[PDB]
Design an enzyme around this catalytic site. Sequence first.
Site, PDB file in Angstrom:
ATOM      1  N   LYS A  64       0.942  -1.285  -0.160  1.00 44.23           N
ATOM      2  CA  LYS A  64       0.018   0.106  -0.120  1.00 44.23           C
ATOM      3  C   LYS A  64       0.990   1.243   0.121  1.00 44.23           C
ATOM      4  O   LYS A  64       1.748   1.364   0.891  1.00 44.23           O
ATOM      5  CB  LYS A  64      -0.979   0.121   1.362  1.00 44.23           C
ATOM      6  CG  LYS A  64      -1.676   1.316   1.632  1.00 44.23           C
ATOM      7  CD  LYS A  64      -2.766   1.452   0.662  1.00 44.23           C
ATOM      8  CE  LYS A  64      -3.271   3.062   0.563  1.00 44.23           C
ATOM      9  NZ  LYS A  64      -4.379   3.154  -0.661  1.00 44.23           N
ATOM     10  N   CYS A 122       0.018  12.493  -5.617  1.00 44.20           N
ATOM     11  CA  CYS A 122       0.000  12.968  -4.374  1.00 44.20           C
ATOM     12  C   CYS A 122      -0.256  14.441  -4.166  1.00 44.20           C
ATOM     13  O   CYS A 122      -0.073  15.051  -5.307  1.00 44.20           O
ATOM     14  CB  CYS A 122       1.547  12.433  -3.819  1.00 44.20           C
ATOM     15  SG  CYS A 122       2.699  12.881  -4.952  1.00 44.20           S
TER      16      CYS A 122
HETATM   17  C1  LIG Z   1      -9.198   0.605  -2.837  1.00 41.87           C
HETATM   18  C2  LIG Z   1      -8.152   0.947  -3.638  1.00 41.87           C
HETATM   19  C3  LIG Z   1      -7.029   1.658  -3.207  1.00 41.87           C
HETATM   20  C4  LIG Z   1      -5.958   2.173  -3.963  1.00 41.87           C
HETATM   21  N1  LIG Z   1      -4.784   2.818  -3.501  1.00 41.87           N
HETATM   22  C5  LIG Z   1      -3.690   2.930  -4.222  1.00 41.87           C
HETATM   23  C6  LIG Z   1      -2.501   3.406  -3.599  1.00 41.87           C
HETATM   24  O1  LIG Z   1      -2.293   3.222  -2.092  1.00 41.87           O
HETATM   25  N2  LIG Z   1      -1.605   3.749  -4.375  1.00 41.87           N
HETATM   26  C7  LIG Z   1      -1.611   3.800  -5.824  1.00 41.87           C
HETATM   27  O2  LIG Z   1      -0.742   3.594  -6.496  1.00 41.87           O
HETATM   28  N3  LIG Z   1      -2.708   3.339  -6.220  1.00 41.87           N
HETATM   29  C8  LIG Z   1      -3.771   2.954  -5.619  1.00 41.87           C
HETATM   30  N4  LIG Z   1      -5.007   2.684  -6.197  1.00 41.87           N
HETATM   31  C9  LIG Z   1      -5.235   2.375  -7.696  1.00 41.87           C
HETATM   32  C10 LIG Z   1      -4.762   1.087  -8.208  1.00 41.87           C
HETATM   33  O3  LIG Z   1      -3.557   0.824  -8.041  1.00 41.87           O
HETATM   34  C11 LIG Z   1      -4.921   0.926 -10.023  1.00 41.87           C
HETATM   35  O4  LIG Z   1      -4.125   1.837 -10.300  1.00 41.87           O
HETATM   36  C12 LIG Z   1      -6.444   1.526 -10.409  1.00 41.87           C
HETATM   37  O5  LIG Z   1      -7.523   0.788  -9.490  1.00 41.87           O
HETATM   38  C13 LIG Z   1      -6.773   1.003 -11.764  1.00 41.87           C
HETATM   39  O6  LIG Z   1      -6.305  -0.373 -11.952  1.00 41.87           O
HETATM   40  P1  LIG Z   1      -7.909  -1.369 -11.827  1.00 41.87           P
HETATM   41  O7  LIG Z   1      -8.626  -0.985 -13.026  1.00 41.87           O
HETATM   42  O8  LIG Z   1      -7.319  -2.831 -11.934  1.00 41.87           O
HETATM   43  O9  LIG Z   1      -8.528  -1.192 -10.832  1.00 41.87           O
HETATM   44  C14 LIG Z   1      -6.003   2.194  -5.418  1.00 41.87           C
HETATM   45  C15 LIG Z   1      -7.203   1.512  -5.993  1.00 41.87           C
HETATM   46  C16 LIG Z   1      -8.146   1.119  -5.349  1.00 41.87           C
HETATM   47  C17 LIG Z   1      -9.438   0.416  -5.899  1.00 41.87           C
HETATM   48  C1  LIG Z   2      -6.933  11.122  -0.976  1.00 45.69           C
HETATM   49  C2  LIG Z   2      -6.296  10.888  -2.355  1.00 45.69           C
HETATM   50  C3  LIG Z   2      -4.924   9.795  -1.963  1.00 45.69           C
HETATM   51  C4  LIG Z   2      -4.388   9.516  -3.131  1.00 45.69           C
HETATM   52  C5  LIG Z   2      -3.271   8.763  -3.198  1.00 45.69           C
HETATM   53  C6  LIG Z   2      -3.473   7.450  -2.837  1.00 45.69           C
HETATM   54  C7  LIG Z   2      -4.640   6.640  -3.790  1.00 45.69           C
HETATM   55  C8  LIG Z   2      -5.861   6.192  -3.348  1.00 45.69           C
HETATM   56  C9  LIG Z   2      -6.438   6.575  -2.017  1.00 45.69           C
HETATM   57  O1  LIG Z   2      -5.893   5.962  -0.976  1.00 45.69           O
HETATM   58  O2  LIG Z   2      -7.499   7.331  -1.916  1.00 45.69           O
HETATM   59  N1  LIG Z   2      -6.822   5.810  -4.483  1.00 45.69           N
HETATM   60  C10 LIG Z   2      -6.411   5.699  -5.749  1.00 45.69           C
HETATM   61  O3  LIG Z   2      -7.187   5.257  -6.612  1.00 45.69           O
HETATM   62  N2  LIG Z   2      -5.168   6.041  -5.979  1.00 45.69           N
HETATM   63  C11 LIG Z   2      -4.224   6.403  -5.206  1.00 45.69           C
HETATM   64  O4  LIG Z   2      -3.126   6.763  -5.532  1.00 45.69           O
HETATM   65  C12 LIG Z   2      -4.740  10.080  -4.449  1.00 45.69           C
HETATM   66  C13 LIG Z   2      -5.913  10.932  -4.542  1.00 45.69           C
HETATM   67  C14 LIG Z   2      -6.640  11.040  -3.283  1.00 45.69           C
HETATM   68  F1  LIG Z   2      -7.444  11.754  -3.333  1.00 45.69           F
END
Ligand SMILES: Cc1cc2nc3c(=O)[nH]c(=O)nc-3n(C[C@H](O)[C@H](O)[C@H](O)COP(=O)(O)O)c2cc1C
Ligand SMILES: Cc1cc(CCc2c(C(=O)O)[nH]c(=O)[nH]c2=O)ccc1F
Lengths: 313, 313
Positions: A44, A131
Amino acid sequence: MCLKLNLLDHVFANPFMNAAGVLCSTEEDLRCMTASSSGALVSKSCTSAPRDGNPEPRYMAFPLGSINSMGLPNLGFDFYLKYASDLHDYSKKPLFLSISGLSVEENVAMVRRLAPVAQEKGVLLELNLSCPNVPGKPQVAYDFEAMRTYLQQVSLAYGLPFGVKMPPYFDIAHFDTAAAVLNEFPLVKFVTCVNSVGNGLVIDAESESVVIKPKQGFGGLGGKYILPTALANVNAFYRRCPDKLVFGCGGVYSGEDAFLHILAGASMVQVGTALQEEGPGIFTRLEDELLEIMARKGYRTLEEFRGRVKTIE
Amino acid sequence: MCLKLNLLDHVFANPFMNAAGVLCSTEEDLRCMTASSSGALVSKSCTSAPRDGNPEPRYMAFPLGSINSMGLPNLGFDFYLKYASDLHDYSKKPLFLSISGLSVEENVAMVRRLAPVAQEKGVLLELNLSCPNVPGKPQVAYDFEAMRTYLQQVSLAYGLPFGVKMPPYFDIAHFDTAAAVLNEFPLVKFVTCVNSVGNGLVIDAESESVVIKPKQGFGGLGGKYILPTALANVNAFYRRCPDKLVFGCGGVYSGEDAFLHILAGASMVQVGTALQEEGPGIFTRLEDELLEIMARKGYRTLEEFRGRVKTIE
Ligand SMILES: Cc1cc2nc3c(=O)[nH]c(=O)nc-3n(C[C@H](O)[C@H](O)[C@H](O)COP(=O)(O)O)c2cc1C
Ligand SMILES: Cc1cc(CCc2c(C(=O)O)[nH]c(=O)[nH]c2=O)ccc1F
Ligand SMILES: Cc1cc2nc3c(=O)[nH]c(=O)nc-3n(C[C@H](O)[C@H](O)[C@H](O)COP(=O)(O)O)c2cc1C
Ligand SMILES: Cc1cc(CCc2c(C(=O)O)[nH]c(=O)[nH]c2=O)ccc1F
């Protein structure tokens, strides 16, 4: 036959891993991803200090994908560094650690500590550029001067090969500018395309309400909604950054979707929403499906078709 | 129970119309739209001179939506101006004329000549900003300074209420900045959200090929892919531009999708990909479906729920 590959001085059993944020927050989650059939895992995105994230509900899924405003809930960098240093079993698969500090200074601080662990253990850094940025400003990766600062500072502080997680772009001039920024940094050895499609809005017709609590229902989109976006970004950076790897993320639910990402130029293929919805069993299915498509086509390696999407004339 | 709207000093039988570019290029197309059950029509975005557009194939549709790099094929401004001036039957329904010049000067010249026909016949201008300016720069509405210049110059030249067609945005900072620009221009009376999601890439697994010929397969995305992006944009501008109307465009295939647009803030609701795929019969279907939802909920008019999406807690 088998899908194993070598990238970044590491061996991988197959090109599949989780997407940052999904199934990777707690020690339990990281042990589960390590026990899966994935080729790698990423942790994460973390901050220096632990965060609770936003109020619930903050994630929801639907037949065509997901929406989230998690708010970066995480156990803090010290936890993820300890997992990388002491807990992860490197004999099982490679580990990527994702960092997403709220300032350049925070990112510098974390990468100076990660560097000796990277040297000792081989953990790989994914720097999430979705970020927070300075007032009145967009996310860092949408502010090209900010992005160049972050990369310069992290490159200097870390001093080792790393990668960057990018948000999607929707304009050919932005692809040109962004890739030119990334190509100023020789330590950026992989680019992961893409993070969620920012600030979508899902509304429920029966309740007449948005479905997540934070941000008046606005959140990043994942899943089927975003596959063509994701493929475009993969291919745009694959074309523009010949000396880097591209990792594909967005909309993978099947080995056919993975196949499309690889044809566009992906080296590793990350799975977010589909993983969150189906669980870690998905990796066996994806592998079998990808090998089935390869066999029907006569391909024996990924390198035979990676980046070989055909254009018309 | 009724779908009637009265806005911009016109009366509309219902909120449905085509999206610019679909079923609106030729006299035949505009007569077809006029004979349909839609509440209004818009003509194809035009340039001063006729354009052939890009080589085919340049549009393709799939179960989840469409991709296009049309290249603005159109019959030229003089043709659309004549249609507005001499051919359109205003007793049937209102007409919007969309313009999309390649420079601020081309737009100024068109609007200067539109103005008297707008005043005498009541044709309504839609200025497409989701459009090329200098190659290597972003599209006009992704370049806020350019957008400001265009709006200042068209406002001075035209001198009458008009609307703007916007591309989607993906960052809160962009919502804030774009809406602040729009709010500088009191003649911008409506904002249409959204144009296609830019530069996606569809690849066909069997052939291992992109599906459109221009731009190495890159093109704008419409349809089911874009509905939550569309809704977000509608609501974002709805909230930020309280003295303007918002028209919704993106991902409408049903009366339920329409209902969500209207809950987000939409006055008019435009239909692109679904119309391209189903044809003009879709408007009777959409009307029936929307009315059924309204009857189940006990809503008697659109104003009862327009912009009334609920947030959590
Ligand atoms: C619940 C959730 C949490 C995520 N948290 C992060 C994160 O901490 N860091 C990040 O680089 N992207 C994060 N993302 C984005 C995913 O890594 C990914 O780029 C995005 O969901 C698109 O891929 P998908 O179509 O397979 O969902 C998150 C996505 C979801 C759904
Ligand atoms: C609050 C917030 C945090 C992030 C960074 C972490 C992240 C998050 C998240 O933890 O919300 N969700 C994503 O889909 N991609 C991300 O990279 C990106 C956008 C946001 F609005
Ligand atoms: C074939 C095609 C041509 C288009 N041409 C135009 C155009 O000339 N002007 C414009 O404002 N938008 C144009 N668009 C965008 C649509 O008006 C609409 O914004 C977009 O397709 C999203 O709506 P949808 O999801 O209903 O397709 C066009 C779309 C398609 C599919
Ligand atoms: C001259 C030119 C104009 C545009 C704008 C027209 C347009 C088109 C188009 O004609 O390709 N397609 C869309 O989905 N939306 C649009 O607004 C897009 C590309 C171009 F090369």
